[PDB]
């Protein structure tokens, strides 16, 4: 009656959830679904208690009455006097990335090129990019802007899924979970790295974590950051070291959500779970680390230092902020 049911998206998150369940003495248990939208439904039905979501999905969950509980907090320099759990969140930088060799490609010449997105409905991979393009274009034909793309969650027969590759066997092409090879931050960057796409819409941190030896993964071993460039909104190109002056927007951190009637209880359990399996936690290297999954960002982003309390007991609109909320509303008017 005090246990929390986590919702895992796909086979791989399920496996990691099972491990966390095991080490937690079943204080945390697992439900699995094929997509993030399905996990939201399980939560609404009361069959699952919570899951960690990107801002775009927090908008979906919010309209159905779910609420933000704790947020991911990564390592920062400016508010260092405070402990991580009480520290305000910074947000992450949504960027557009391309290969240096693809000279001449800028924000103003993206039309008819190939694109890589984390997934439809997500912040850096979809909502920010497509919202900007719709506006600048005065057209809701965002499905006709790029020639081909990999945008998990779109119609598998459409050009928005033309570049997705599915799993080991070619199955599940374009599904919005980690079985799709080019899903998420890591998948979209891989889509660019292997030159399947011309541009990838991810966040500043993804570039760094997958270049100059930070990943050991087969496809990323030899990637150097100097071989990449960020596309700035003023039509210019810059090194990935200038993200603070060349980003598409700053995004609200991913956060854990749950039904409001279950928030207090989910918050309590999670705080104890991270004291055990978090970054400096009692059991981390030794038995289990909640925030690691070999660059796959399973359940949580691998660069998470801790889950932080929110303060001001924000509604979902307050958490996302009015700038971002109006952006999504406007883009949704199209769909």
């Amino acid at each position: 009656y005090t246990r929390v049911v986590w919702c895992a998206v796909g086979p791989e998150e399920q496996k990691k959830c099972q491990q966390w369940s095991q080490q937690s003495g079943q204080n945390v248990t697992c439900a699995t679904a094929s997509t993030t939208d399905d996990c939201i439904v399980l939560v609404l039905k009361g069959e699952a208690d919570a899951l960690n979501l990107d801002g775009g999905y927090i908008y979906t969950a919010g309209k159905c009455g779910l609420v933000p509980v704790l947020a991911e907090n990564r390592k920062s320099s400016k508010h260092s006097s405070l402990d991580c759990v009480l520290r305000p969140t910074e947000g992450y930088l949504a960027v557009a990335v391309v290969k240096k060799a693809n000279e001449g490609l800028t924000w103003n010449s993206l039309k008819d090129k190939k694109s890589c997105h984390t997934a439809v409905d997500r912040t850096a991979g979809w909502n920010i990019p497509m919202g900007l393009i719709v506006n600048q274009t005065g057209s809701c034909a965002f499905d006709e802007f790029f020639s081909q793309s990999c945008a998990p969650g779109a119609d598998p027969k459409s050009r928005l899924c033309a570049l997705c590759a599915g799993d080991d066997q070619g199955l599940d092409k374009c599904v919005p979970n980690s079985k799709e090879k080019y899903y998420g931050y890591t998948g979209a960057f891989r889509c660019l790295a292997e030159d399947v796409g011309d541009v990838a819409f991810v966040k500043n941190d993804t570039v760094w974590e997958n270049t100059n030896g930070e990943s050991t993964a087969d496809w990323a071993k030899n990637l150097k950051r100097e071989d990449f460039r960020l596309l700035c909104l003023d039509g210019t190109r810059k090194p990935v070291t200038e993200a603070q002056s060349c980003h598409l927007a700053v995004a609200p951190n991913h956060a854990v959500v749950s039904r409001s009637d279950r928030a207090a209880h989910v918050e309590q359990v999670l705080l104890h779970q991270q004291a055990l399996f978090g970054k400096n936690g009692k059991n981390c290297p030794d038995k289990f680390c909640l925030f690691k999954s070999e660059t796959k960002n399973l359940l949580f982003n691998d660069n998470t230092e801790c889950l932080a309390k929110l303060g001001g007991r924000p509604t979902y609109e307050e958490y996302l902020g009015t700038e971002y909320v109006t952006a999504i509303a406007n883009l949704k008017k199209c769909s």
């Binding site: 939208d37 939201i40 439904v41 609404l44 979906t60 309209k63 159905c64 009455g65």
Partner: peptide, 5 residues
Amino acid sequence: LEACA
């Protein structure tokens, strides 16, 4: 309703 609003 699962796009509740």
